[PDB]
Amino acid sequence: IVGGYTCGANTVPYQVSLNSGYHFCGGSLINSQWVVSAAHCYKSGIQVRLGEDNINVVEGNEQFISASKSIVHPSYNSNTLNNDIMLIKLKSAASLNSRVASISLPTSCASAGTQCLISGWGNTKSSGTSYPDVLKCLKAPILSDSSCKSAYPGQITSNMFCAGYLEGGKDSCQGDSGGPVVCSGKLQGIVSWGSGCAQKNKPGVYTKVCNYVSWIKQTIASN
Ligand SMILES: NC(=[NH2+])c1ccc2[nH]c(-c3ccccc3[O-])nc2c1
Ligand SMILES: [Ca+2]
Ligand SMILES: [Cl-]
């Protein structure tokens, strides 16, 4: 997260870190056995880490559970990143409490202007790599479709939305991929891509979760 602030330990209880010997992506806990992340974060050997704050120190509240299966959306296109969503089923259920809690799926899409919270352990520099030890937060608004399409002409599908600041300085960045964009208490986006980090006129692009709610519910119901 570039231009963000320290969230405070366990203030984002649905945030998870996907770990394969190191933190590589974020994700959101939606029920005690399922996590939603981005299809581009897929790999085998994933250990999901819940109740984390400092990812390099065990401090208490952490739950490390291995993933039993990862379901990448069947129509995920790795070249356009359209349908960039993946569901991970955990080997055992997480113990939920106030430090580890699930986030609700939306019942409607959000409108531009809606203010949202984006969080993650990704890079905090737009030029160079500086990964933090603790979770960073950023409040960003959803942008109108014309500003998003004018920023990335021909690269935005109806399953994507832009959120951020055109003046630059604040944005999600690598290491944040797969993580949550929560607005009014609902999971509305997943950190997907952007051109560089915090560059002027290049806002972040997020998977529009309101378009996959029936798919998420049907897929969890059948697995
Ligand atoms: N500017 C942004 N809002 C942004 C967000 C997520 C990103 N993820 C990445 C990324 C870069 C290299 C490898 C994997 C990634 O997900 N770049 C990213 C840029
Ligand atoms: Ca820790
Ligand atoms: Cl266009």
Side-chain angles (χ1 to χ4, degrees), residues 40 171-174 177 191-194 196-197 204:
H40 77 257
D171 189 11
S172 48
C173 195
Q174 61 182 316
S177 280
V191 186
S192 187
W193 60 277
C197 299

Side-chain angles (χ1 to χ4, degrees), residues 24-128:
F24 64 91
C25 276
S28 299
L29 183 67
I30 53 169
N31 57 52
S32 53
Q33 225 173 341
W34 290 91
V35 167
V36 180
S37 181
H40 77 257
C41 285
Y42 175 90
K43 60 171 64 176
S44 46
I46 294 181
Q47 180 180 60
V48 179
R49 295 184 172 206
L50 301 90
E52 283 280 13
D53 186 42
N54 178 319
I55 53 169
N56 288 306
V57 178
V58 173
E59 298 176 320
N61 298 309
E62 297 94 340
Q63 287 179 53
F64 292 175
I65 306 183
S66 297
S68 196
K69 50 159 58 181
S70 297
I71 305 188
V72 162
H73 191 278
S75 304
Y76 165 60
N77 185 310
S78 51
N79 299 290
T80 58
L81 285 190
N82 185 40
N83 304 300
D84 193 10
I85 180 169
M86 165 180 79
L87 289 173
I88 303 177
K89 190 185 193 187
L90 308 182
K91 187 167 292 184
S92 38
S95 312
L96 303 186
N97 51 68
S98 46
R99 276 75 94 236
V100 177
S102 46
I103 181 62
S104 306
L105 290 176
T107 32
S108 52
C109 298
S111 46
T114 296
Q115 213 68 36
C116 307
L117 183 73
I118 308 176
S119 49
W121 293 277
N123 192 12
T124 50
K125 296 171 60 58
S126 35
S127 315

